[PDB]
Amino acid sequence: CSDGNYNRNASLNSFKEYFNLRNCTFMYTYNITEDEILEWFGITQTAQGVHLFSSRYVDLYGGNMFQFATLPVYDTIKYYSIIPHSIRSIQSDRKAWA
Amino acid sequence: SDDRTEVPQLVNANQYSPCVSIVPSTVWEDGDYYRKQLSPLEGGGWLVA
Amino acid sequence: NLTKLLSLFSVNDFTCSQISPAAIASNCYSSLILDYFSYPLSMKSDLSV
Amino acid sequence: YSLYGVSGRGVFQNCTAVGVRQQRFVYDAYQNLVGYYSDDGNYYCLRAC
Amino acid sequence: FVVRIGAAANSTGTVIISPSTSATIRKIYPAFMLGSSVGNFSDGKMGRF
Numbered sequence: 214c215s216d217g218n219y220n221r222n223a224s225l226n227s228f229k230e231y232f233n234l235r236n237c238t239f240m241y242t243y244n245i246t247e248d249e250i251l252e253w254f255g256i257t258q259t260a261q262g263v264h265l266f267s268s269r270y271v272d273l274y275g276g277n278m279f280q281f282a283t284l285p286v287y288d289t290i291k292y293y294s295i296i297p298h299s300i301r302s303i304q305s306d307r308k309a310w311a
Numbered sequence: 312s313d314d315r316t317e318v319p320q321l322v323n324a325n326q327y328s329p330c331v332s333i334v335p336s337t338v339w340e341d342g343d344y345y346r347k348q349l350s351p352l353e354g355g356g357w358l359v360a
Numbered sequence: 361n362l363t364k365l366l367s368l369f370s371v372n373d374f375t376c377s378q379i380s381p382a383a384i385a386s387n388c389y390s391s392l393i394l395d396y397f398s399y400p401l402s403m404k405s406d407l408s409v
Numbered sequence: 410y411s412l413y414g415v416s417g418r419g420v421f422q423n424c425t426a427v428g429v430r431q432q433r434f435v436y437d438a439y440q441n442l443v444g445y446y447s448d449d450g451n452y453y454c455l456r457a458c
Numbered sequence: 459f460v461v462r463i464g465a466a467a468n469s470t471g472t473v474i475i476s477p478s479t480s481a482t483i484r485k486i487y488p489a490f491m492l493g494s495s496v497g498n499f500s501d502g503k504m505g506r507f
Contacts, residue, residue, distance in 0.1 A: 224489070249467040249485050255460040256490075260325015263492075266460075271431040278460065279431055288494045289326045293459075294505055296489035307479065309471040310486035311464045313386030332495060350497060352504075 224298070239285060245269065253278050262286050312355045330360035372401055377409045410455065412447055419444060419455030426452060461488055 214220070246269075255266030255278045263286040266278040300310065322328055333345040345360040362385055374381045399407065410419055414434060424445060428435045433446035435454075444455030464485030473479040493507040 245487075249464065251465050251467070251485075252463045253460060254463055254488070256492075271429070279429075287325070287327070288331075289323075290492045291494055292496045292507070293490055293492040294507075296491050298486070298489060307473045307476065307481060309473050309481040309483045311466045311483050313380065313382035313384070315386050317387075352496075 228296075241282065241284070243281065250274070251276065258286070258290050260287070263290065328360075330358065333358060334360050373404060375409075414447075415442065417442070417455070418458045421445075421448075421453035421455050424452050424454035428452075463487065 250273060252273070253266075253268040253276050257264045257266075261283055263284040264280055265282040265284065267281050268276045268278050270281055271277065271279040300308070302308065320329055328334075330345070333347045347358045349356055349358055376384055379387075410417055410421065421444075428445065430446075434442050435445060437443040441457075442455060445452040447453075466483045467485040469483050470480050471483045473481055491507055495507070496504075497506050498504055499506045
């Protein structure tokens, strides 16, 4: 996270240490402007695929969520988990994360 | 788990069968049958096709 | 009530074919046949499907 | 008009300024659309016949 | 589901791994794993998709 040279694959690389990714049907990226503003994210599914929602693009300052992607995932999602992230800071660089 | 009842699963529109995990992409021979024991978390009992 | 009947006796072995002991208590049927006789536990290996 | 989203018959006017502006209709509490979007990019609010 | 992200950003809070240490809270983004079929890893722990 050094100025002007953020590692855009840091988390992906860490994930690839625990799992090999095989037969990926898609990998999409969505750019995010850096700020400390409250936001809302949502996810639903229909026969059309998995729908992602965010307040960021259409209502950054108010929080209403709008659709920004439909993912071609047509096998019904039944389960989810939260992937734990840990920040490999040194002691003097420790922050609190919301 | 034997309980008192058994049910047949009907897919909602825009979804694959829960049995696509155990039925090959092409059936080898007419009338073949597939089974898979379920984890206690999945509900226990079996899945059958 | 079959678990009733099997609570009178001390039960030493329970195996089923094309069904389970759990399942055979639960389900409903159009016909149930019960065959009973004297038979020694020593000869369990000979009472098999 | 005949928008991709819906049919209809309306009198478009360059009105102001109420909507969502990211997806491209605006309704008024019923099935009807009152009515701008779609033009690129302005407010052509529609009316009934 | 919907997710409230970054609500405490800018306030003062603990560093978690060192509870006696406080710091300014920064927004962090969540990560999710979603799928159709789950079970256990080879050593028996849950969470395998």
